[PDB]
């Protein structure tokens, strides 16, 4: 649970290719928006942050959306403590891919109450095909938070990662 007395949280960002998981992560870690698309195999970042007064060590795993790197899933799902399940609000297919990740996480962790947050990214764009209410209704049925983000403008970026931390904390305080 702790590293040098700081509370450790192992966050994993998952979702289809091109949804913005790297841009989100890099916005949180480095406070800059990546405009280019450099597909990820698997990257990781640590960040010391205060969340609700608690000094946390975040270990954020930035995973592959491209199917060619699927063999790496089982390993990150075993070690991850909470999952940001990311789709893009202009990509219907990405929204339809959410439960591919969710069900795989549940299967690997053999658990129905794994901490997760649904993230609808690219909320800056005009061309929305996935509505707020539609994604909200899904997250409600899952019993998880839903947050709209823009890696470009920073809207909701902290909220997405910090909500996940709060959910893990609540899951842990239960036990
Ligand atoms: N307008 C806008 N573009 C975004 C946003 N987030 C990401 N992008 C762009 O979308 C493209 C892909 O973003 P990435 O973060 O590389 O995507 P990814 O989900 O990490 O992709 P994989 O690593 O292949 O799974 C890039 O060109 C980003 O600049 C956002 O919030 N708004
Ligand atoms: N966790 C998980 N994700 C999966 C699985 N199969 C596919 N995916 C994800 O979903 C994507 C493919 O789903 P779609 O967006 O419908 O794509 P598609 O039509 O099958 O193929 P393309 O459009 O060519 O990418 C992959 O790139 C992965 O990100 C699976 O078994 N488990
Ligand atoms: Mg990436």
UniProtKB/Swiss-Prot annotation:
Residues reported in the UniProt entry to bind GTP: 15-23, 34-35, 62-66, 121-124
Gene Ontology cellular-component annotations: cytosol; endoplasmic reticulum membrane; extracellular exosome; Golgi apparatus; Golgi membrane; membrane; plasma membrane; tertiary granule membrane
* UniProt entry tagged with the keyword Phosphoprotein: yes
Membrane topology of the entry? Lipid-anchor
Keywords, in A-Z order: Acetylation, Cell membrane, Disease variant, Glycoprotein, Golgi apparatus, GTP-binding, Hydrolase, Isopeptide bond, Lipoprotein, Membrane, Methylation, Nucleotide-binding, Palmitate, Phosphoprotein, Prenylation, Proto-oncogene, Ubl conjugation
Q: What class of enzyme is it?
A: hydrolase
Q: What InterPro entries does the record point to?
A: P-loop_NTPase, Small_GTP-bd, Small_GTPase, Small_GTPase_Ras-type
PTM remark: Palmitoylated by the ZDHHC9-GOLGA7 complex. Depalmitoylated by ABHD17A, ABHD17B and ABHD17C. A continuous cycle of de- and re-palmitoylation regulates rapid exchange between plasma membrane and Golgi. Acetylation at Lys-109 prevents interaction with guanine nucleotide exchange factors (GEFs).
Gene Ontology BP terms: MAPK cascade; positive regulation of endothelial cell proliferation; Ras protein signal transduction
Glycosylation site residues: 40
PROSITE patterns in the record: RAS
Q: Where in the cell is it found?
A: Cell membrane; Golgi apparatus membrane
The record names the disease as: Leukemia, juvenile myelomonocytic: An aggressive pediatric myelodysplastic syndrome/myeloproliferative disorder characterized by malignant transformation in the hematopoietic stem cell compartment with proliferation of differentiated progeny. Patients have splenomegaly, enlarged lymph nodes, rashes, and hemorrhages. Noonan syndrome 6: A form of Noonan syndrome, a disease characterized by short stature, facial dysmorphic features such as hypertelorism, a downward eyeslant and low-set posteriorly rotated ears, and a high incidence of congenital heart defects and hypertrophic cardiomyopathy. Other features can include a short neck with webbing or redundancy of skin, deafness, motor delay, variable intellectual deficits, multiple skeletal defects, cryptorchidism, and bleeding diathesis.
Subunit structure of this entry? Interacts (active GTP-bound form preferentially) with RGS14. Interacts (active GTP-bound form) with RASSF7. Interacts (active GTP-bound form) with both SHOC2 and PP1c (all isoforms) to form a tertiary complex; SHOC2 and PP1c preferably bind M-Ras/MRAS, but they also bind K-Ras/KRAS, N-Ras/NRAS and H-Ras/HRAS.
Other information = Mutations which change AA 12, 13 or 61 activate the potential of Ras to transform cultured cells and are implicated in a variety of human tumors.
Q: Which family does it belong to?
A: Belongs to the small GTPase superfamily. Ras family.
Q: Which PANTHER family does the UniProt entry name for this protein?
A: RAS, DI-RAS, AND RHEB FAMILY MEMBERS OF SMALL GTPASE SUPERFAMILY
Identify this protein by name.
GTPase NRas
Q: Which organism is it from?
A: Homo sapiens
What does the organism's lineage look like at the top? Eukaryota, Metazoa, Chordata, Craniata, Vertebrata
Gene symbol?
NRAS
């Amino acid at each position: 649970l702790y590293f040098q007395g700081m509370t450790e949280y192992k966050l994993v960002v998952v979702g289809a290719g091109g949804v913005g998981k790297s841009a989100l992560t890099i916005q949180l870690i480095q406070n800059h928006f990546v405009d280019e698309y450099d597909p990820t195999i698997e990257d990781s970042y640590r960040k010391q942050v205060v969340i609700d007064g608690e000094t946390c060590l975040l270990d954020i795993l930035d995973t592959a959306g491209k199917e060619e790197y699927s063999a790496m899933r089982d390993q990150y799902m075993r070690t991850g403590e909470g999952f940001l399940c990311v789709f893009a609000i202009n990509n219907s297919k990405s929204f339809a891919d959410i439960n591919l990740y969710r069900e795989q996480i549940k299967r690997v962790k053999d658990s129905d109450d794994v901490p997760m947050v649904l993230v609808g990214n690219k909320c800056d764009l005009p061309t929305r095909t996935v509505d707020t209410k539609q994604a909200h209704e899904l997250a409600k049925s899952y019993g998880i938070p839903f947050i709209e983000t823009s890696a470009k403008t920073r809207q909701g970026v902290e909220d997405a990662f910090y909500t996940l931390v709060r959910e893990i904390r609540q899951y842990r305080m239960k036990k």
